[PDB]
Write a protein that binds this ligand. Structure first.
Ligand SMILES: Nc1ncnc2c1ncn2[C@H]1C[C@H](O)[C@@H](CO[P@](O)(=S)OP(=O)(O)OP(=O)(O)O)O1
Ligand SMILES: [Ca+2]
Length: 427
DNA sequence: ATTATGACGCT
DNA sequence: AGCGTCAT
């Protein structure tokens, strides 16, 4: 009771851009706005692989990982934008630069953790304290906010439902104590409305957001009312929310571990985890995972928002599927050079922008016949930002992977090359 | 023949 | 270090 931690100490938000590469292309090309459209990379094999889909196109069943030719079967009027090709490969610079636009705006409000190209966590605990001292919260301050779990108790069109939930929530708020976690989340949501308004004003991009007491709940919250809306998941909302929430929906449980939780414990939903002792969960899933699961199923998580706005690595990779697999030494060296020249370009820009230098080069390849995504990974020193040097260095660290007796040929053929700059130091 | 990324845990 | 897992 009196000593029972409730994980209500922080206000954390997760901001997730909607259909982000699509929005980047729609900003650039007005003709794509408010249309079923997708972003595709390459075009020769089956029309290209889809990596992003507008919500209009999702209504037809178009998804990521679909070939454009097949998506066209579902949606004949589907519009497509192609990822830039440079030096023979897809080049994601446009989307990395758009990401920086959003991340810099978010950083005006609080220190962010860059989670992916279009997602960032923010710890709003301090900003909420400040806003609290400056002030009753009007519904007008929360025009795109859902309160998860509401309305409840004794019209039915979506905006009506949203407002009815929001009204129940605000009506229940004890606003006179500056210590109420629910009030803190609410003020957090007011700030996120402001952040999201600024992102849209200043970039043209819309996004969704979750507000809760930790990163995992904020992330879960965010997805509950995509797109262009934000969702508040209170501590009190967790038992009902988790009672029907498949374990795989929770960040880090969407893979083998999550499947093992389901299989070993014979459960389906996050809420069912509460019936196990911490020691029981540790016994099955290890010390760290077990403690993490015990707290998480009660809505409690302690992973901090890390103050990191920049990626920790800068990498360049290309697959050579089917019989495009690299079988000659000339081929291997040409493509290592292409990758190295892109890497050099991005590295030089990074050093100018961000006052840092990578010190380690990681070289990864895949060989035809291997089932793993990476067959072999070797590091060497990265001492100069020089593409010819990096490509030569990469070749020497992998050249003995060639089982071919003659060194004019490469065997078994390479189906992936990967160069990654790591271990940055200030400069 | 999804591809091109990127963070973090394990030993 | 090199490899595996999990995620955009
Ligand atoms: N598997 C994969 N390969 C390549 N690029 C990807 C992949 N997944 C996502 N992305 C890119 C393209 C996306 O626009 C961008 C962000 O991914 P996410 O957030 S999973 O999806 P979005 O396109 O932003 O739609 P959504 O967030 O509104 O659901 O990363
Ligand atoms: Ca997104």
């Amino acid at each position: 009771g009196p000593h029972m931690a409730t994980g209500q100490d922080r206000v954390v938000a997760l901001v997730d851009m909607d259909c982000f590469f699509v929005q980047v292309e729609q900003r650039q090309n007005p003709h794509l706005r408010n249309k079923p459209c997708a972003v595709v990379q390459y075009k020769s094999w089956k029309g290209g692989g889809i990596i992003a889909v507008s919500y209009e196109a999702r209504a037809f069943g178009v998804t990521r990982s679909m070939w454009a030719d097949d998506a066209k079967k579902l949606c004949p009027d589907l519009l497509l934008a192609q990822v830039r090709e440079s030096r023979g490969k897809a080049n994601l610079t446009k989307y990395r630069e758009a990401s920086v636009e959003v991340m810099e705006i978010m950083s005006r409000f609080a220190v962010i953790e860059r989670a992916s190209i279009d997602e960032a966590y923010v710890d709003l605990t301090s900003a909420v304290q400040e806003r609290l001292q400056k002030l009753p919260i009007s519904a007008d301050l929360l025009p795109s906010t859902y309160i998860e779990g509401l309305p409840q108790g004794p019209t039915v069109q979506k905006e009506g439902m949203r407002k009815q939930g929001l009204f129940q929530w605000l009506d229940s708020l004890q606003i006179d104590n500056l210590t109420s976690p629910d009030l803190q989340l609410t003020v957090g949501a007011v700030i996120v409305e402001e952040m999201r308004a600024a992102i849209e004003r200043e970039t043209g991009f819309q996004c969704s957001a979750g507000i809760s007491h930790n990163k995992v709940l904020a992330k879960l919250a965010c997805g509950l009312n995509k797109p262009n809306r934000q969702t508040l998941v209170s501590h009190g909302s967790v038992p009902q929310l988790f009672s029907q929430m498949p374990i795989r929906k929770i960040r880090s449980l969407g893979g083998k571990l999550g499947a093992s939780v389901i299989e070993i414990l014979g459960i389906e939903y996050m809420g069912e985890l509460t019936q196990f002792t911490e020691s029981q969960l540790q016994s099955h899933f290890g010390e760290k995972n077990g403690s993490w699961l015990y707290a998480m199923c009660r809505g409690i998580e302690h992973d901090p928002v890390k103050p990191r706005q920049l990626p920790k690595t800068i990498g360049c990779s290309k697959n050579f599927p089917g019989k495009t697999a690299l079988a000659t030494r000339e081929q291997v060296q040409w493509w290592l050079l292409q990758l190295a020249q892109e890497l050099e370009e991005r590295l030089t820009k990074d050093r100018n922008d961000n006052d840092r230098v990578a010190t380690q080069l990681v070289v990864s390849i895949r060989v035809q016949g291997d089932k793993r995504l990476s067959s072999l990974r070797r590091c060497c020193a990265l001492t100069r930002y020089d593409a010819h040097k990096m490509s030569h260095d990469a070749f020497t660290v992998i050249k003995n992977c060639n089982t071919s007796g003659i060194q004019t040929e490469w065997s078994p053929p390479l189906t992936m090359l990967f160069l990654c700059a790591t271990k940055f130091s200030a400069s």
